[PDB]
Amino acid sequence: MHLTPEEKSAVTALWGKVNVDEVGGEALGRLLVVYPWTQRFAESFGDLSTPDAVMGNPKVKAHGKKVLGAFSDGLAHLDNLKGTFATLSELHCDKLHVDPENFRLLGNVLVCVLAHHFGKEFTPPVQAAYQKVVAGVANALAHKYH
């Protein structure tokens, strides 16, 4: 987590404009569609057979919102991600058995989502700040694996 002050202000200024409900749904939905293998964790979500079935599934939308919810909180503790995410890291490992690579795929999808939404506003340099951020969060979420 080598976020320069200016990188941190940039992350924070943009995060100001995000509708976490919405972004959360899009990011998770898109994950399940671009990397269908990730659907292994959601057999109880119902119908994920097509893009529309995934993007529109009430269960995917609700889960996305939850996930981005936790991510937003992470954004307020950029100084202590490991701490912030420790009980969640344990849960994903010990109970959910989620391969941490999943956390990196979601980060990339999220970055594409932000690009999608902010257009020209998601400048090369803002992307680089967000790249450091999703990597920091994925690392924090994997810190307790064993």
Binding site: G29, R30, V33, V34, P51, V54, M55, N108, V111, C112, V113, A115, H116, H117, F118, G119, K120, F122, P124, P125, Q127, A128, Q131
Partner: protein, 141 residues
């Protein structure tokens, strides 16, 4: 393997790029340089400053090649043979870097084609870039 669906998706999304491919190619590079600085080790000879003509020049070359793979979507291995040879034998770019560029290309397109950058298209474009990368890396060993 790309499905008919995928093919339609790619031709469509790339269709929209049109005349901006060059600029989008340049932008994908800059994004890459900024987010994954290790990729810079391959361009020690370039001016990587913002608005570098070398980068502009290079973005166009990359975009032309992608445009060429789209035009030959059913025969990419052959359409890209020469480039596959160049990369394996001269440039010798480590394979992991292809995924980094692919990623920055998807961000660029996302940033410019909001109406077309749908979930389905995103998936198609991702499989496409993966396939291009595979071709370009096929003769490495």
């Amino acid at each position: 393997v790309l499905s008919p669906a995928d093919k339609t998706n790619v031709k469509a999304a790339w269709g929209k790029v049109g005349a901006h491919a060059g600029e989008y190619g340049a932008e994908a590079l800059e994004r890459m340089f900024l987010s994954f600085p290790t990729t810079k080790t391959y361009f020690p000879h370039f001016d990587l400053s913002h608005g570098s003509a070398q980068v502009k020049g290079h973005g166009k070359k990359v975009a032309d090649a992608l445009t060429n793979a789209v035009a030959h979507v059913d025969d990419m291995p052959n359409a890209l043979s020469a480039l596959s040879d160049l990369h394996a034998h001269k440039l010798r770019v480590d394979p992991v870097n292809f995924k980094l560029l692919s990623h920055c290309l998807l961000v660029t397109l996302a940033a410019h084609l909001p109406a077309e950058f749908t979930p389905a298209v995103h998936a198609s474009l991702d499989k496409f870039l993966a396939s291009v990368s595979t071709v370009l890396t096929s003769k490495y060993r």
